[PDB]
Paper text:
Here we describe the discovery and characterisation of endo-acting glycoside hydrolases expressed by mucin-degrading members of the HGM that are able to cleave the O-glycan chains of a range of different animal and human mucins. These O-glycanases display endo-β1,4-galactosidase activity and specifically target the polyLacNAc structures that comprise the main backbone of many mucin glycan chains. Overall these data reveal that the nine GH16 enzymes analysed are endo acting β1,4-galactosidases that display a preference for polyLacNAc structures found in mucins and other similar glycans such as KS.
The apo structures of BACCAC_02680, BACCAC_02680E143Q, BACCAC_03717 and Amuc_0724 were obtained to 2.0, 2.1, 2.1 and 2.7 Å, respectively. BF4060 and BACCAC_02680E143Q have four fingers and BACCAC_03717 and Amuc_0724 have five out of six possible fingers that have been observed previously in other GH16 structures. In contrast, BACCAC_03717 and Amuc_0724 both possess a finger 2 (in addition to 1, 3, 5 and 6) and this has a more variable topology than the other fingers. For Amuc_0724, finger 2 sits over the top of finger 1, but in the BACCAC_03717 structure it points away from the cleft. This could reflect the flexibility of finger 2 in this enzyme and could potentially come down over loop 1 in solution like in the Amuc_0724 structure. The B-factor putty projections of the GH16 crystal structures show finger 2 is dynamic in the BACCAC_03717 and alternative conformations of individual fingers from of other GH16 family members has been observed previously, a finding which is indicative of flexibility. The structures for BACCAC_03717 and Amuc_0724 are more accommodating of milk oligosaccharides and have more open +1 subsites.
Residue numbers in the entry: -6 to 241
Write the structure that this text describes.
C-alpha cells in the first residue's frame, strides 16, 4: 500500500480482536448481560449483580441459590454475557480461555448463534457449542445443532458432537475454526473433531458460514445435566480472555 507493496506473505492466523477483561466491568460496546428465557439454558439467566464479578483481570460468572419468594422466581440464578447486537464474528477461529469448578447440576457453556436474529431461526440458522461441561466431568462436549441434526434427526452422519478430556482444575482453551466446508473444534490446540459440509439430498446441513454472536454463561439444571445440589453452590466459571483470529 501507500509505502510498501501487496505486502506478499505466507497467510497465517492473525489476531483481529481480543478481550482480556481488563476493566471495572465487561466492555459495554461488546457485552450485555443475558436476560431470562424459557429454554433449560436460559431458565436461570439474571441481571442480579451477585452473578457477575471482575476479579484479578478475570471475568467471573456465578450460579447461586435464589432467595426470591415471588411465585414466578427461578430456584437458581446464573450470570451470562453475549455479544448480540454489539459484535459479530465472521467465521475465523474463536477461542476462550476459562477455568471451571465442579457442581452437581452446573453446565457452563461457550457457544455461538447467528448474529442476524431477524433473519435466522433456531435450529435452521445453526448453533455451535464451543464448550459444555456437565456436573464434575473431566471432559467437555463440543457440538453443532441444525435443521439437519435436530429437526430431521440426522445426528450421527456426520457425527454432530464429541467429548474430549480437560484439566478440570486448570484453565483450558476452547476453540472452533470456521471454514467454508467444515468446522474444526479444539481444546488446548488438540483437535476434538471436524463437522463436515457433506453432499446431501436434504437442506440445512451446513448453515454456519454466517456472522455469529458469542455467548458465555453459567447454567444450572435441565433434563441433560440432571438435578442441582444446592450444597455445591455458589459456583463460578472464570474467563481469562476471548481471542478471534482470521487466516490471512
Amino acid at each position: 500500500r501507500g509505502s510498501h507493496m501487496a505486502s506478499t506473505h505466507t497467510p497465517k492466523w492473525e489476531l483481529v480482536w481480543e478481550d482480556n477483561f481488563d476493566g471495572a466491568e465487561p466492555d459495554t460496546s461488546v457485552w450485555s448481560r443475558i436476560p431470562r428465557g424459557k429454554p433449560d439454558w436460559q431458565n436461570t439467566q439474571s441481571f442480579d449483580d451477585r452473578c457477575y464479578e471482575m476479579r484479578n483481570g478475570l471475568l467471573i460468572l456465578k450460579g447461586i441459590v435464589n432467595d426470591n419468594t415471588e411465585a414466578d422466581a427461578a430456584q437458581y440464578l446464573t450470570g451470562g454475557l453475549w455479544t448480540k447486537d454489539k459484535r459479530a464474528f465472521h467465521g475465523g477461529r474463536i477461542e476462550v480461555r476459562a477455568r471451571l469448578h465442579g457442581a452437581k447440576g452446573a453446565w457452563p457453556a461457550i457457544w455461538t448463534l447467528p448474529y442476524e436474529t431477524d433473519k435466522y431461526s433456531w435450529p435452521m440458522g445453526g448453533e455451535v457449542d464451543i464448550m459444555e461441561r456437565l456436573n464434575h466431568d473431566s471432559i467437555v462436549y463440543q457440538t453443532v445443532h441444525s435443521h439437519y441434526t435436530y429437526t430431521l434427526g440426522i445426528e450421527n452422519n456426520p457425527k454432530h458432537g464429541n467429548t474430549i478430556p480437560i484439566n478440570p482444575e486448570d484453565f483450558n482453551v476452547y476453540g472452533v475454526d470456521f471454514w467454508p466446508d467444515s468446522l474444526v473444534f479444539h481444546v488446548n490446540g488438540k483437535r476434538n473433531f471436524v463437522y463436515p459440509r457433506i453432499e446431501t439430498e436434504q437442506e440445512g446441513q451446513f448453515p454456519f458460514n454466517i456472522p455469529q454472536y458469542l455467548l458465555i454463561d453459567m447454567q444450572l439444571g435441565g433434563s441433560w445435566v440432571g438435578t442441582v445440589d444446592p450444597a455445591d453452590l455458589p459456583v463460578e466459571m472464570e474467563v481469562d480472555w476471548v481471542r478471534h483470529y482470521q487466516w490471512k
